[PDB]
A paper describes a structure:
In this study, a new thermotolerant and exceptionally halostable [name] from an Icelandic Thermoanaerobacterium hot spring isolate was identified and characterized. CelDZ1 has an (β/α)8-barrel structure with two additional β-hairpins, one at its N terminus and another preceding helix α6.
The N-terminal 49 amino acids forming the transmembrane helix and a linker to the catalytic domain were not defined due to disorder in the crystal. The other two monomers, C and D, form fewer crystal contacts and are less well ordered. The CelDZ1 model also contained 585 ordered water molecules and several ordered isopropanol, ethylene glycol and polyethylene glycol molecules that were present in the crystal cryoprotectant. The residues Pro157, Pro306 and Ser329 are in the cis conformation in CelDZ1.
Residue numbers in the entry: 50 to 119, 126 to 383
């Protein structure tokens, strides 16, 4: 079982024998393993105590990510309750300003980020539970976040005012910064890293659309991860799926094995997409499964999709022995 906030305390980047990694208050390496909500506008019913209790207790998650797409400003309320439910259920919590369309974390439509982050931070001053993720997936869709240094620099100009502000009020939280091409470029930050001892860099992958190795070569995403790591950055996988990059297809579980070996061997924390019951391969729950499992109840394994079942075993760290899906 991966360590809970009750035993890990404040997370910080530590260095051991020349290598940086995510560590706890005691100065030991730690790995976070959990689940991301789907968009909190589309799937807010996951923000319930019985669900968060089940993920923490049964799935043995030490983290949950609250994907707030940027609909209504009322979505902000489900984030607050989610933060509350996570603290109360002994889990780290990623507050994800979930940019996607447009792709630019700056571009007009994302005005209130610093403002939003200010609010959450004020409500929970230097709370050990919270991890701030400033921009889910900077990307080229309706934006000039290009797949290069110039694109990384726009992301950096967006992130720094928010980081400084957070640090000024005494917030020593892990901050995770996204990067170009849907957060597949943590290597771009090597060129010009954020001067903050507790900033990490996102990487995202979908195992049906990305392999660790192909035709003898390290794949693009895995090698971009390696480049950031070799150059003294740390990487946190705030979103990966067992499906294709659409969120559907497969699941691709043999490829997931290889990704997870690669991440565990490098002590890279990871959060699986997603806690939906949408009819898509990446969704952890069957379409007929309620996102509230009931009072004192967990979801049964047969209420979980093939992906959900697989990720649950991996979060727990138990061998994966899939159930029979036919009975007569
Ligand atoms: Cl196994």
């Amino acid at each position: 079982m991966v360590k809970k906030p009750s035993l890990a305390g404040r997370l910080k980047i530590i260095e051991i024998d020349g290598r940086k990694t995510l560590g706890d208050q005691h100065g030991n390496p730690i790995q976070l393993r959990g689940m991301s909500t789907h968009g909190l506008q589309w799937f807010p019913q996951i923000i319930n105590n019985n669900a968060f209790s089940a993920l923490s207790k049964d799935w043995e998650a030490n983290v949950i990510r609250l994907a707030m797409y940027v609909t209504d400003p009322s979505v902000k309320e489900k984030v607050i309750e989610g933060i509350n439910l996570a603290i109360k259920n002994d889990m780290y919590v990623i507050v994800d300003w979930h940019i996607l369309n447009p792709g630019d974390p700056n571009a007009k439509i994302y005005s209130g980020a610093k403002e939003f982050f200010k609010e959450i931070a004020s409500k929970y001053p230097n709370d050990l539970h919270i991890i701030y993720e400033l921009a889910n997936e900077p990307n080229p869709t309706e934006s000039d976040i290009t797949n290069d240094i110039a694109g990384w620099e726009k992301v950096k100009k967006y992130a720094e005012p928010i980081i400084k502000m957070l640090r000024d009020m005494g917030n020593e939280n892990i901050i995770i910064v996204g990067n170009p091409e849907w957060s597949t470029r943590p290597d771009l930050a090597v060129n010009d890293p954020i001067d903050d001892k507790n900033v990490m860099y996102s990487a995202h992958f979908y195992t049906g659309s990305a392999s660790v190795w192909e035709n003898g070569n390290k794949g693009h995403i895995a090698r971009n991860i390696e480049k950031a790591l070799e150059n003294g950055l740390t990487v946190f996988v705030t979103e990966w799926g067992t499906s294709e990059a659409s969120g559907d297809g497969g699941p691709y579980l043999n490829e997931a094995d290889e990704w997870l070996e690669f991440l565990n061997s490098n002590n890279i924390s990871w959060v699986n997409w997603s806690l939906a019951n949408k009819n898509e391969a990446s969704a952890a729950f069957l379409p007929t499964t309620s996102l509230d499992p009931g009072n004192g109840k967990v979801w049964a394994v047969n209420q979980l999709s093939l992906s959900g079942e697989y990720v649950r075993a991996r979060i727990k760290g138990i061998p994966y022995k899939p159930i029979s899906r036919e009975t007569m």
